[PDB]
């Protein structure tokens, strides 16, 4: 997170860390949606261009964290994966369209004050909160600069940008399954997700029922916090049917 602050203890209890077993390292962020399911970006797992193609066995999911490098004994839980499901049409060949993945944990995790799931949005919440100008929040242990890694989980609140503006900032083809957020060069405010933040959650707090909903997943961007550029996220509500299908079929 570039231009974000240190989060607070229990601020994002759904933040999950994808940890590789060897070498032991932070891969991406993910989010806790139920006692057994984790949501992340498919590019965190499979990205043929750079020979990435991980399986259950190569990853670990660390939940309940704050510190990035320490094993927070008695606070975080570590789970192994049972299954990884990638969206059948995730497009890694062109623009990371449908960049979403679900992981099933081996065993349920028990919630705590540090571990609690986020809500997935419903047609009406998507409708009323995904509006340009409205701010969402992103969290992660990724880099602090484009080219510098934090000790604690970082957070930044960004505005959603009008689609015309998102499309006119890049040459990549935006699809309806993504959205972009960030301040304009002309808003004297900065912030963005960066490397190490992919897979994590972009959330909003509903003023109707005070609950936090996850509207996006960190997908991509060109550099970090560059002026004129924006961060693109997967549109969770547009891929929700897919989500429900794999969670009630498996």
């Amino acid at each position: 997170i570039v231009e974000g602050s240190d989060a607070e203890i229990g601020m994002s209890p759904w933040q999950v860390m994808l940890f590789r077993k060897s070498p032991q390292e932070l891969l991406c962020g993910a989010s806790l949606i139920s006692d057994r399911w984790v949501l992340t970006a498919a590019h965190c797992l499979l990205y043929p261009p750079w020979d990435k193609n991980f399986t259950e066995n190569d990853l670990l999911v660390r939940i309940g964290k704050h510190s990035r490098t320490r094993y927070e004994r008695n606070i975080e839980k570590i789970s192994m994966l049972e299954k990884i499901y990638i969206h059948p049409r995730y497009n890694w060949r062109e623009n990371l369209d449908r960049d979403i993945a679900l992981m099933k944990l081996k065993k349920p995790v028990a919630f705590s004050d540090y571990i609690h799931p986020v809500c997935l949005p419903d047609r009406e919440t998507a409708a009323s909160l995904l509006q340009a100008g409205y701010k969402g929040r992103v969290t992660g242990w990724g880099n602090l600069k484009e080219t510098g890694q934090p000790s604690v989980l970082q957070v930044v609140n960004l505005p959603i940008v009008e689609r015309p503006v998102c499309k006119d900032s890049t040459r990549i083809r935006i699809t309806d399954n993504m959205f972009c957020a960030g301040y304009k060069p002309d808003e004297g405010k900065r912030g963005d997700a960066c490397e190490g933040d992919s897979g994590g959650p972009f959330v909003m707090k509903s003023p109707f029922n005070n609950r936090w909903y996850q509207m996006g997943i960190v997908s991509w961007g060109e550099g970090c916090d560059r002026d004129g550029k924006y961060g693109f996220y997967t549109h969770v509500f547009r891929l929700k049917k897919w989500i429900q299908k794999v969670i009630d079929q498996f």
């Binding site: 077993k21 670990l60 660390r62 990035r68 490098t69 094993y71 570590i78 192994m80």
Partner: peptide
């Protein structure tokens, strides 16, 4: 850089 985690999480 990362601290070690309990061995029963590798297996």
């Amino acid at each position: 850089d990362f601290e070690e985690i309990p061995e029963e999480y590798l297996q």
